[PDB]
Amino acid sequence: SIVIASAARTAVGSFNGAFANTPAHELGATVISAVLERAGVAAGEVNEVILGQVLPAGEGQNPARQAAMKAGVPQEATAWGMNQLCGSGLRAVALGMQQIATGDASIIVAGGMESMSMAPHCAHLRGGVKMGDFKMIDTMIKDGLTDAFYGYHMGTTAENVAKQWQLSRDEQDAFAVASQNKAEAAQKDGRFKDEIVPFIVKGRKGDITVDADEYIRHGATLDSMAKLRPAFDKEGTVTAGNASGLNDGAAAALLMSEAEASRRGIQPLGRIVSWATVGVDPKVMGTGPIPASRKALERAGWKIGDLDLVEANEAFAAQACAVNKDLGWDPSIVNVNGGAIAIGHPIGASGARILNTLLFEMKRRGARKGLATLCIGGGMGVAMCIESL
Amino acid sequence: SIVIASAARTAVGSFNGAFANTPAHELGATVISAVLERAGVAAGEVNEVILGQVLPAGEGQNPARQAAMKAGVPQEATAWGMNQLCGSGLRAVALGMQQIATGDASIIVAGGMESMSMAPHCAHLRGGVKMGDFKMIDTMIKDGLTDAFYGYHMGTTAENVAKQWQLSRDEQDAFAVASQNKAEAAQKDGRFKDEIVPFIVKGRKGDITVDADEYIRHGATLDSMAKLRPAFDKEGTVTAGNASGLNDGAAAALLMSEAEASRRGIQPLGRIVSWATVGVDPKVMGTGPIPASRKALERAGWKIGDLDLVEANEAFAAQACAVNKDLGWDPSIVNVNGGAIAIGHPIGASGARILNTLLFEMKRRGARKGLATLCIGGGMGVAMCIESL
Amino acid sequence: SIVIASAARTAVGSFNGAFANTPAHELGATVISAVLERAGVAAGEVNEVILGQVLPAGEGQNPARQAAMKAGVPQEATAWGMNQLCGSGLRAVALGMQQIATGDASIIVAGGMESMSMAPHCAHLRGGVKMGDFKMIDTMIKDGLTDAFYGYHMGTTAENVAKQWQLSRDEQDAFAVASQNKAEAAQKDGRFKDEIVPFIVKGRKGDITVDADEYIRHGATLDSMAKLRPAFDKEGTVTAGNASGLNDGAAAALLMSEAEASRRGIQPLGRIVSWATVGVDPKVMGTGPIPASRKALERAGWKIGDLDLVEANEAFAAQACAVNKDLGWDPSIVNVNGGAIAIGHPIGASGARILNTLLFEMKRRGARKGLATLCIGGGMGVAMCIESL
Amino acid sequence: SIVIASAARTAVGSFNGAFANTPAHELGATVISAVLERAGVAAGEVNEVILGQVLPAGEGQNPARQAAMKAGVPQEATAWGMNQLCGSGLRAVALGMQQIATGDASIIVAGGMESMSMAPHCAHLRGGVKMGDFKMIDTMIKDGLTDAFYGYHMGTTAENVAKQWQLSRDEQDAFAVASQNKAEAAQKDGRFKDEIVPFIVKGRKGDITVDADEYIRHGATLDSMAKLRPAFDKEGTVTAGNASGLNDGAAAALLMSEAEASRRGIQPLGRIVSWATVGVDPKVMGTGPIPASRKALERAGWKIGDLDLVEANEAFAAQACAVNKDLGWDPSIVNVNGGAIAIGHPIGASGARILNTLLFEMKRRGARKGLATLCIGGGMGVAMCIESL
Ligand SMILES: CC(C)(C)C(=O)OCC(C)(C)[C@@H](O)C(=O)NCCC(=O)NCCS
Ligand SMILES: CC(C)(C)C(=O)OCC(C)(C)[C@@H](O)C(=O)NCCC(=O)NCCS
């Protein structure tokens, strides 16, 4: 019924690296223009831009509208941002699907975008500080990475999964290195070229073309993984080596009906058969993909074994192993081109990020059925089942 | 097909007034609890909570999810935030409608919440300020009230509609006083009692029940309206009197299928017959309701005359007159209980705010057909058509 | 040898009260102008202005220079600021004396000034805050009121003196009340009128003449002294009642040689017979006056019993009691017009503030010999012996 | 009568260079320790530490005291800071000379210190910012570099002198280049080794001994001087090239009577024969040294031509050329080892900085008579005359 006619994403930049001073919407407009060009669709035909974003503070009125306009999307179309944390970028696509499936839109550019580098430090100063020190809060850590309920970092929820699923430090590091090695492999071999649209960083003493994911470590060893001290719990198991990073990027897909893509002579990246969002305990938020993937697979009518390829978001090696262990799919078809540990985790763009990687591999190796899924902070999961035409 | 079984909202509080230190998500949870109680539905049955919010900076991971949890909605359900500026609150309800219509949920608590008082000041300070003065930005003005393209306050876009539609200073003031007078009459008569749910402001030396809209001025004269200097263009026409304020509040609805509401013995507030969202030039953003209501009316198969009641969001007196003048509906059925000039304009909650007034008046006077609509910053407009059962 | 030909001071203002927005150097100039007028000396004749100030941050290059210039003191003269914390106001005068004593100056204006109200909040942001919350620090508490070594507030030092000298809560409160009552009586009787020079608070909707010390409480009860909880040690004895306050003010003296006064027909307020400064352990910094006063007396050739009036600064009741107890002078001739608990403690001015009160009482009651002394943070004291001609 | 028994100064570090994160009081303690060590005098015997500092904001109660204590100077001794801008560091020595000459002290450690790197940004936020943006002020620019009266940077004052004394862009550059080259030669030859005491920068992944002035440029060309744009007046003549810099450092000298040195077996660096400070128009503040040196030479009984070495601080090439031009001393005996354009300008330390270089070259070449002088912001100068025993 509803298809992804085309897709694209920026390289994922490191924290204060390639896109340190690059606002989220500028990344988004580049990806909106890209999906338009790749599908052979004019921006004048786009009805609505839906972009997941978690940290828009200080970027001004509705960055989704700013991205759209700069992308040459007309003023008659509509745009908006949404926040389901890590799940946003993929949910935007599902929400984009719903627009078309209910007859409220024909063509929808959806996905997500995030500049964790440009998230500001903030403080409430309307009441006035008569006396005493006050905190300037990092919006990134407050609004993106710390649980609202139990007050600790997402890495502490990773510890709760690691201890519950008795996943050792050695098992988490081996998965970590495996992610880095696969991701260097898929990089050298050009397997990220299709999906990645170059982004021109507008400078002063020189522009810079970024078309390579700069967070991927090259020649990552097990020895350098085992020496790092625990990043959250000081007698724990999760580290900066086996957790995801702080990153900037954007990613999007162009949605339309299966009839509309056929009219236009477009051969789509895939057909969205079903999606699903489900909740879990915020203490073990890393177990989100388990019920959400299972819900999606139930809507699609598929069993776990029918999947040819899977993109399960690596938020932490503890939670990425747990999802894999519970669902029991073949690990050789999971994150075939590495995952978020190596590639990075631009919160709002992360779901649209892993949708690209899934769609292009499905096209490249001839996979029929595929699934994407991310764990979501606050204790939820989102999933989406794709079938190729 | 899809119905609002029940609804509720907090009193709209002034800037740094009744809810000066009350985070949005607390206001949201009360409204969730209210809509659950008023329908006779347990929090356990709620599949998702979709909350429009514009200024969540500093409030922590996904305030929609915080609102839900504190409301007693279980961990299995889902929750997310979205931003289409003023139109966020009403677009939550259409998006919540879409979930049910597409068979992805059975019950949805949609609406919006806003704490403008708690919107922090910010600045991006990762790079370091090697030397010189910097600016601490007001995330309320920047992210909520300033246009991202031309750089000015929304009041200057109200000046562009005033000069284009040649609406004099005297016409706008008259409309400003009429909104205040209508809203005081509805307040004294208890017409806001149904929709408003009391909110307990948790104090230290005494709690405070807020169940009255404290921004409504009592005994508003034309003379105090005509003495205020222009707020934006110093030789212009728009003022603090004829413009909307900065306000806190929350508003929500409980959505389910028409058959489900019949199963549960619930007599709904109304049936959502259509909606629509459209774009226009950001310079004349106030005109958003003109094409958006026209589209909505076209999707419902209705003519403008068929409407028995209308809520057109008074962002400014210049734009409120323009929409009424273009569409040409009988002005005696528009904002009958007053509007945003008098009541307030909590950005994210405003679309859910005006929905509640429409629904409870439609029920109280026996209006069959009704329409709600808001103008959106960045240059857009949303509209929803409601028919009672 | 050297005499104080004239002196003046502003009413001491409350924290964020009369002088809330009045920069320190404006108060300093008013007082500079005053001592010139009161001695019959033209600003043209002034060689240098020396002003103790502790919290000048954000006021600009060298507030002392700004003070002098606005007083009409000519550009050919020189001016500077100095910081020895609480001692700074009185040490300036001893420093002024030394300029004249060594032939480097004929006419010196010396004293101090302080706007604790206008002390700003600060933070070091040049390196950049890559990630995580940071503190905006209160320069008033950081640079004025916290010990640099042991890291606690001056009130905790006050507790160290309380316990070492076994001074009860009851003893501190009575003293606190005795200061307030003496101070109110001296106010009502007009005894502050000679020393105070009115200050014109330049407003916008009306100027305001401040010439009554506003922090002096009227009708202070022992019962309201007994009920306050301890401000520093939550099981301690020092409170906001028995400690000094946070205040604004300036004060200054006009120095020249005894021969020079006689040439001009001036009858001086006093002859500066000696001064001293001495150090003690910072834990017990309130004990500064004990060895300082003793030293000054030894340099003067005077015994303690030869003094007719004393102004021993009340930073805290605990230390104030200790100094009296150790030195053993007649308490009926100490802070006869009340003290800093009642009057205020504008850190940098405080030493000139107490000189004024000493000098004008000595003239009024015909005391021949007098002594002024303040305890200093970081463990120091300063004393100065005055004799009348 | 009074002599300098010993002296010492840190390397002067670049803005956010070697001491980027080193509080001024750590630099002042190393220099206190040094001057004690170098005279054969124990901290125990030090009566007082007097340190000029202009930007102590955020460092805590009285850095002078903190420096002294860290240096091992005992709690019985006393300590304070003063501010006369660029003059601060040298006036401390004159103020130290006065303590001994009037019998109030026997041994004084005096001089200055400054960490411009660590100067914080501040804002006055007690009243509450109700609404709108506010400025975070750079204390270094506001409180150290901008003129309080006319509101412009010190550099603009430099232009007034350039225009008044008709000093061309070419003449300023040649002077600028010549300071660099003379300073590189002295550096390479070890001529700064005597005066400099190494400073251990405590780190975490290593300590660092800084004992070389890092701001000195090597192989400076006239060409690169000519290409720079005017830093202040955009059609002006003064640049970053020919202006001094922003710098960190400390410097100190140890004073005692000539007899006291004779008793201790010490051979002093020099006798202080006179000093002076004088005022001029703030507009042309760079002319400060002219009347201050003239005054100084008069009190000494010396004509200008008697001087064998001179250290005339280089705040700006324009002013430096002015002072040399007006006073007419042999330019070959002035700043013989280079100056502030090359070495840097740690505002509060600078006057002691230049004392050191004067003192150690007078010893090394056998100059009998010498003179140091600095121009001072707000419109003043200071000068000190030194003779060798
Ligand atoms: C705001 C108000 C009324 C002052 C109050 O309640 O607080 C009391 C407070 C701030 C704890 C107390 O530290 C105080 O006012 N101290 C000033 C005394 C002080 O530190 N003096 C320096 C001389 S050594
Ligand atoms: C150091 C850096 C960042 C390269 C630079 O821009 O230096 C040039 C700068 C900052 C514009 C210029 O104002 C400067 O360095 N001035 C210091 C000279 C100065 O005013 N000293 C005070 C004595 S009157």
Short mmCIF file of C-alpha atoms in Angstrom, two decimals, chain A residues 57-358:
data_model
loop_
_atom_site.label_atom_id
_atom_site.label_comp_id
_atom_site.label_asym_id
_atom_site.label_seq_id
_atom_site.Cartn_x
_atom_site.Cartn_y
_atom_site.Cartn_z
CA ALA A 57 16.40 24.24 21.83
CA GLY A 58 17.83 27.50 20.45
CA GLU A 59 17.33 26.67 16.75
CA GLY A 60 14.15 28.78 16.56
CA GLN A 61 10.58 28.12 15.40
CA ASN A 62 9.97 24.55 14.20
CA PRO A 63 13.24 23.35 12.60
CA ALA A 64 11.13 20.93 10.53
CA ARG A 65 9.60 23.93 8.76
CA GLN A 66 13.10 25.52 8.41
CA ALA A 67 14.53 22.36 6.84
CA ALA A 68 11.61 22.06 4.43
CA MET A 69 11.81 25.67 3.25
CA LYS A 70 15.58 25.62 2.70
CA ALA A 71 15.13 22.31 0.83
CA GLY A 72 12.94 24.26 -1.65
CA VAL A 73 9.72 22.69 -0.36
CA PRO A 74 7.03 25.30 -1.08
CA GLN A 75 5.19 27.51 1.44
CA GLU A 76 1.84 25.73 0.67
CA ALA A 77 3.11 22.42 2.11
CA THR A 78 3.26 21.79 5.87
CA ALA A 79 5.96 20.68 8.28
CA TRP A 80 6.48 19.62 11.90
CA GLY A 81 8.85 18.02 14.42
CA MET A 82 8.17 15.21 16.91
CA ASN A 83 9.86 13.59 19.91
CA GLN A 84 9.79 9.94 20.92
CA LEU A 85 13.49 10.13 21.77
CA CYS A 86 15.57 7.43 19.97
CA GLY A 87 12.42 6.10 18.22
CA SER A 88 11.46 9.46 16.67
CA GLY A 89 13.21 9.11 13.27
CA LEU A 90 11.48 5.81 12.49
CA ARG A 91 8.12 6.80 13.98
CA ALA A 92 8.16 9.90 11.76
CA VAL A 93 8.14 7.52 8.78
CA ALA A 94 5.24 5.52 10.25
CA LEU A 95 3.38 8.77 11.05
CA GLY A 96 4.19 9.78 7.45
CA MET A 97 2.71 6.49 6.26
CA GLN A 98 -0.50 7.22 8.19
CA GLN A 99 -0.94 10.59 6.45
CA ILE A 100 -0.99 8.80 3.06
CA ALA A 101 -3.00 5.76 4.23
CA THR A 102 -5.80 8.01 5.57
CA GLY A 103 -5.98 10.16 2.39
CA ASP A 104 -4.67 13.36 4.01
CA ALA A 105 -1.50 13.51 1.85
CA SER A 106 0.03 12.07 -1.34
CA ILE A 107 3.77 12.58 -0.77
CA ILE A 108 5.52 12.73 2.58
CA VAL A 109 9.18 13.37 3.37
CA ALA A 110 9.79 11.84 6.82
CA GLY A 111 12.70 10.85 9.03
CA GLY A 112 14.71 12.75 11.63
CA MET A 113 17.56 15.14 12.39
CA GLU A 114 19.71 16.01 15.40
CA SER A 115 22.54 18.35 16.31
CA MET A 116 23.67 17.19 19.74
CA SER A 117 26.70 19.43 19.28
CA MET A 118 24.41 22.52 18.98
CA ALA A 119 22.20 21.67 21.95
CA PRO A 120 22.75 24.64 24.34
CA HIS A 121 23.22 24.97 28.10
CA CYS A 122 20.15 26.50 29.76
CA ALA A 123 18.70 27.78 33.03
CA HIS A 124 15.39 29.15 34.34
CA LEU A 125 16.00 32.77 35.34
CA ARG A 126 12.55 34.40 35.15
CA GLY A 127 12.01 34.34 38.94
CA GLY A 128 15.42 35.98 39.49
CA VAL A 129 18.27 34.54 41.55
CA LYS A 130 18.34 36.72 44.67
CA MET A 131 21.40 34.96 46.10
CA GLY A 132 23.44 31.76 45.71
CA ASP A 133 24.83 29.63 42.88
CA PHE A 134 22.67 28.20 40.12
CA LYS A 135 23.04 25.49 37.50
CA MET A 136 23.33 25.99 33.76
CA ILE A 137 21.86 22.72 32.57
CA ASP A 138 23.09 20.78 29.55
CA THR A 139 19.88 20.31 27.55
CA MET A 140 21.54 17.36 25.76
CA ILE A 141 22.09 15.42 29.00
CA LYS A 142 18.83 16.60 30.62
CA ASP A 143 16.39 16.29 27.69
CA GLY A 144 18.13 13.54 25.63
CA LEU A 145 20.13 11.13 27.80
CA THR A 146 18.83 11.19 31.45
CA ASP A 147 15.73 9.27 32.55
CA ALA A 148 12.99 11.58 33.79
CA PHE A 149 11.78 9.13 36.45
CA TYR A 150 14.81 7.49 38.16
CA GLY A 151 17.14 10.42 37.41
CA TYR A 152 20.13 8.45 36.07
CA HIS A 153 21.78 8.30 32.62
CA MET A 154 20.60 5.80 29.99
CA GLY A 155 23.85 3.88 30.65
CA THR A 156 22.49 2.95 34.10
CA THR A 157 19.46 1.32 32.39
CA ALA A 158 22.04 -0.54 30.29
CA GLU A 159 23.51 -1.86 33.57
CA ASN A 160 20.03 -3.02 34.64
CA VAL A 161 19.72 -5.06 31.43
CA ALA A 162 23.31 -6.35 31.67
CA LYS A 163 22.73 -7.61 35.25
CA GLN A 164 19.23 -8.95 34.53
CA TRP A 165 20.42 -10.80 31.40
CA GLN A 166 23.77 -11.61 33.09
CA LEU A 167 25.75 -10.26 30.11
CA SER A 168 29.46 -10.18 31.02
CA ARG A 169 31.96 -7.39 30.30
CA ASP A 170 33.73 -9.70 27.82
CA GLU A 171 30.51 -10.42 25.86
CA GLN A 172 29.74 -6.68 25.63
CA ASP A 173 33.25 -5.82 24.40
CA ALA A 174 33.28 -8.60 21.74
CA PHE A 175 29.98 -7.27 20.35
CA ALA A 176 31.48 -3.76 20.48
CA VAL A 177 34.54 -4.75 18.44
CA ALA A 178 32.36 -6.74 16.03
CA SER A 179 30.30 -3.58 15.40
CA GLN A 180 33.47 -1.54 14.70
CA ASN A 181 34.94 -4.16 12.37
CA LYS A 182 31.73 -4.64 10.35
CA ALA A 183 31.33 -0.86 10.04
CA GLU A 184 34.92 -0.32 8.85
CA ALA A 185 34.33 -3.18 6.38
CA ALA A 186 31.08 -1.74 5.00
CA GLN A 187 32.84 1.68 4.81
CA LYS A 188 35.98 0.61 2.91
CA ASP A 189 33.82 -1.55 0.61
CA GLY A 190 31.68 1.48 -0.32
CA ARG A 191 28.50 -0.03 1.18
CA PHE A 192 27.66 3.33 2.81
CA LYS A 193 28.04 5.28 -0.47
CA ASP A 194 24.51 4.76 -1.80
CA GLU A 195 22.72 5.89 1.37
CA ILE A 196 25.06 8.75 2.31
CA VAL A 197 24.42 12.08 0.58
CA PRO A 198 27.44 14.40 0.92
CA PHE A 199 26.91 17.47 3.14
CA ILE A 200 28.75 20.70 2.34
CA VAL A 201 29.80 22.37 5.61
CA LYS A 202 29.62 26.09 4.80
CA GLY A 203 32.86 27.55 6.19
CA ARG A 204 34.77 30.84 5.95
CA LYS A 205 38.34 29.83 5.03
CA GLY A 206 37.17 26.82 3.00
CA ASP A 207 34.09 24.64 2.58
CA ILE A 208 34.28 20.98 3.59
CA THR A 209 32.56 18.00 1.95
CA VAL A 210 31.61 15.36 4.55
CA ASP A 211 30.54 12.04 2.96
CA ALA A 212 32.21 9.57 5.37
CA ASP A 213 30.99 8.58 8.83
CA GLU A 214 33.77 9.96 11.06
CA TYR A 215 32.82 8.17 14.30
CA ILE A 216 33.77 4.72 12.95
CA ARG A 217 37.05 3.60 14.54
CA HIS A 218 39.53 1.87 12.22
CA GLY A 219 41.32 -1.29 13.38
CA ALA A 220 39.44 -1.38 16.71
CA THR A 221 41.02 -3.95 19.06
CA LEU A 222 39.69 -6.02 21.98
CA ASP A 223 42.59 -4.80 24.18
CA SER A 224 41.57 -1.11 23.97
CA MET A 225 37.97 -2.20 24.67
CA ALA A 226 38.93 -4.08 27.87
CA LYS A 227 41.08 -1.28 29.39
CA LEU A 228 38.39 1.45 29.57
CA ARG A 229 36.90 2.04 33.03
CA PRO A 230 33.08 1.83 33.45
CA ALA A 231 31.47 5.10 32.32
CA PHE A 232 28.39 5.12 34.62
CA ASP A 233 28.49 2.55 37.46
CA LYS A 234 32.09 2.70 38.81
CA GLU A 235 32.08 -1.06 39.62
CA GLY A 236 29.91 -1.90 36.60
CA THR A 237 30.22 -3.30 33.09
CA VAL A 238 29.17 -0.63 30.52
CA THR A 239 31.82 1.78 29.15
CA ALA A 240 32.50 4.39 26.46
CA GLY A 241 33.76 1.47 24.36
CA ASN A 242 30.53 -0.62 24.36
CA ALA A 243 27.97 2.22 24.51
CA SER A 244 26.86 4.46 21.64
CA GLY A 245 28.30 7.96 21.23
CA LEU A 246 27.01 11.48 21.01
CA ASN A 247 26.61 12.40 17.36
CA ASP A 248 25.09 14.74 14.71
CA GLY A 249 23.24 13.67 11.57
CA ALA A 250 20.00 13.49 9.60
CA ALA A 251 18.13 10.92 7.51
CA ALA A 252 14.88 10.73 5.54
CA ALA A 253 12.61 8.74 3.22
CA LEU A 254 10.12 9.81 0.53
CA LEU A 255 6.75 8.07 1.08
CA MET A 256 3.90 7.65 -1.42
CA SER A 257 1.37 4.97 -2.42
CA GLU A 258 2.34 1.83 -4.41
CA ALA A 259 0.06 3.09 -7.19
CA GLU A 260 1.71 6.56 -7.15
CA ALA A 261 5.27 5.19 -7.40
CA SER A 262 4.13 3.01 -10.34
CA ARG A 263 2.59 6.04 -12.13
CA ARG A 264 5.90 7.91 -11.79
CA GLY A 265 8.16 5.11 -13.12
CA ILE A 266 9.86 4.93 -9.74
CA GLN A 267 11.03 1.62 -8.36
CA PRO A 268 10.86 1.95 -4.56
CA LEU A 269 13.39 0.94 -1.91
CA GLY A 270 10.56 -0.95 -0.19
CA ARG A 271 6.95 -1.39 0.94
CA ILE A 272 5.98 -0.66 4.57
CA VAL A 273 3.99 -3.75 5.55
CA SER A 274 3.54 -2.96 9.27
CA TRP A 275 4.93 -1.04 12.25
CA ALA A 276 4.47 -1.15 16.03
CA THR A 277 5.20 0.80 19.20
CA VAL A 278 5.03 -0.80 22.68
CA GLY A 279 6.10 0.16 26.21
CA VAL A 280 8.29 -1.41 28.89
CA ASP A 281 9.76 -0.56 32.31
CA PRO A 282 11.96 2.58 32.06
CA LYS A 283 14.48 0.76 34.33
CA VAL A 284 15.19 -1.75 31.52
CA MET A 285 14.45 0.59 28.60
CA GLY A 286 16.90 -1.35 26.42
CA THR A 287 14.37 -4.21 26.09
CA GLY A 288 12.07 -2.04 23.92
CA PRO A 289 12.77 -3.80 20.57
CA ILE A 290 11.59 -7.16 21.94
CA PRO A 291 7.82 -6.52 22.27
CA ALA A 292 7.72 -3.86 19.52
CA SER A 293 9.44 -6.09 16.91
CA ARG A 294 7.18 -8.97 17.97
CA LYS A 295 4.10 -6.73 17.64
CA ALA A 296 5.17 -5.52 14.17
CA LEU A 297 5.90 -9.11 13.04
CA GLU A 298 2.40 -10.09 14.26
CA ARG A 299 0.79 -7.28 12.23
CA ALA A 300 2.86 -8.25 9.17
CA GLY A 301 1.79 -11.91 9.57
CA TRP A 302 5.48 -12.91 9.59
CA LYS A 303 7.48 -15.19 11.88
CA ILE A 304 10.91 -14.13 13.18
CA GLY A 305 12.60 -16.60 10.81
CA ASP A 306 11.09 -15.04 7.66
CA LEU A 307 13.29 -11.95 8.07
CA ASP A 308 16.27 -11.81 5.72
CA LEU A 309 17.87 -8.71 7.29
CA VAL A 310 17.52 -6.77 10.55
CA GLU A 311 18.65 -3.40 11.84
CA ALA A 312 18.50 -3.43 15.65
CA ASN A 313 19.82 -0.10 17.02
CA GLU A 314 22.95 -0.49 19.15
CA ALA A 315 22.27 1.95 22.00
CA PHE A 316 24.35 -0.23 24.34
CA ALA A 317 26.09 -3.60 23.79
CA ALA A 318 24.22 -4.85 26.89
CA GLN A 319 20.78 -4.08 25.41
CA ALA A 320 21.74 -5.00 21.81
CA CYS A 321 22.80 -8.51 22.97
CA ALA A 322 19.62 -8.87 25.10
CA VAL A 323 17.30 -8.06 22.18
CA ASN A 324 19.20 -10.54 19.97
CA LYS A 325 19.15 -13.20 22.71
CA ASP A 326 15.41 -12.88 23.43
CA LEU A 327 14.07 -12.71 19.85
CA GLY A 328 16.57 -15.34 18.71
CA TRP A 329 17.02 -14.24 15.09
CA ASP A 330 20.21 -15.24 13.24
CA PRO A 331 22.90 -12.77 14.39
CA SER A 332 24.66 -12.90 10.98
CA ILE A 333 21.78 -10.90 9.40
CA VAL A 334 21.69 -8.33 12.24
CA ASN A 335 23.50 -5.02 11.67
CA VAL A 336 25.39 -6.64 8.79
CA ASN A 337 27.04 -3.26 8.11
CA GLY A 338 27.80 -2.54 11.79
CA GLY A 339 25.64 -0.43 14.10
CA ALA A 340 25.22 2.66 16.29
CA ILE A 341 28.26 1.88 18.49
CA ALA A 342 30.52 2.36 15.44
CA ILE A 343 28.35 4.67 13.29
CA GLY A 344 27.02 6.87 16.13
CA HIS A 345 23.64 7.77 17.65
CA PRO A 346 22.06 11.07 16.53
CA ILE A 347 19.01 10.62 18.78
CA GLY A 348 16.22 12.11 16.61
CA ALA A 349 17.79 10.95 13.33
CA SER A 350 18.76 7.48 14.62
CA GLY A 351 15.58 5.69 13.46
CA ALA A 352 15.66 7.17 9.96
CA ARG A 353 19.41 6.45 10.02
CA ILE A 354 18.93 2.70 10.54
CA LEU A 355 16.05 2.66 7.98
CA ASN A 356 18.47 3.82 5.25
CA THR A 357 21.13 1.20 6.13
CA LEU A 358 18.37 -1.50 6.06
#
